[PDB]
């Protein structure tokens, strides 16, 4: 696995479903496919109204069965701890990896919470959080903000990439 989690905004924007959920038990691993699944109790949906209606529920999250291919291993003892999960729907099943944005709800900054609730959706049409995957991080588009932190980091925790007008975005810590 060569990946780390994205900026929360990119997570929001690329994910089909962003939910708040409880992990309700030990994983069920399948040797015939190399997916494991976790049973979850969905407490809140912040995005996915697009994909799901009123009576839709998500009971399982699928991930690779092993760490070498970015399989998610849930580290929590407490089954009442709520997690933010940002994932992809593949054939109507919710999938994550360790490259997904998955974290305890209460570990998130206030800005991140507002982000998932309210603000990150504002950046999805126009704006791109551009990682410094390369070494000389020069801006390639007026619609990009540069994400220069490794992790947890200031920019993940405090900032969104928001449009100020057509073809221009910028890091903001507010609104």
Q: How far apart are CA 131 and CA 63, in angstroms?
A: 24
Q: Which domain holds residue 142?
A: 8-172
1 is in an annotated binding site: yes
Q: Is residue 64 part of a domain?
A: yes
Q: Is residue 2 part of a domain?
A: no
Four-point Cα dihedral 38, 75, 102, 148, nearest 10? -150
70 phi/psi in degrees, rounded to 5: 75, 25
Helical (H) or strand (E) element with 155: helix 154-158
This structure was determined by X-ray
Q: Which of 63, 68, 72 is nearest to 93 (CA)?
A: 63
Q: Output the CA–CA distances (angstroms, integers) from residue 103 to 29, 44, 144, 145, in the order listed.
A: 22, 15, 25, 23
Write out the two tokens for 149: 């932190």
Strand partners, 165: 168
**42 located within any domain:** yes
Overall resolution, Å: 2.0
CATH of the domain at 133: 2.40.50.120
CA distance 126 to 128: 7
Is 57 domain-assigned?
yes
Residue 53 lies in a domain: yes
């Amino acid at each position: 696995c060569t990946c780390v989690p994205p900026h929360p905004q990119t997570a929001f924007c690329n994910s089909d479903l962003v939910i708040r959920a409880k992990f309700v038990g030990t994983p069920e691993v399948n040797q015939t496919t190399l997916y494991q699944r976790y049973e979850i109790k969905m407490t809140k949906m912040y995005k996915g109204f697009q994909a799901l209606g009123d009576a839709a529920d998500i009971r399982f999250v699928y991930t690779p069965a092993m760490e070498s291919v970015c399989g998610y291993f849930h580290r929590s003892h407490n089954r009442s701890e709520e997690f933010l999960i940002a994932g992809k729907l593949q054939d109507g099943l919710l999938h994550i990896t360790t490259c997904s944005f998955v974290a305890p709800w209460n570990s998130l900054s206030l800005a991140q919470r507002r982000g998932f609730t309210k603000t990150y959706t504002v950046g999805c049409e126009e704006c791109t959080v551009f990682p410094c995957l390369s070494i000389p991080c020069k801006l390639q588009s007026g619609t990009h903000c540069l994400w220069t932190d490794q992790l947890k980091g200031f920019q993940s925790r405090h900032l969104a990439c928001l449009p100020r007008e057509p073809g221009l975005c910028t890091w903001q810590s507010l609104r």
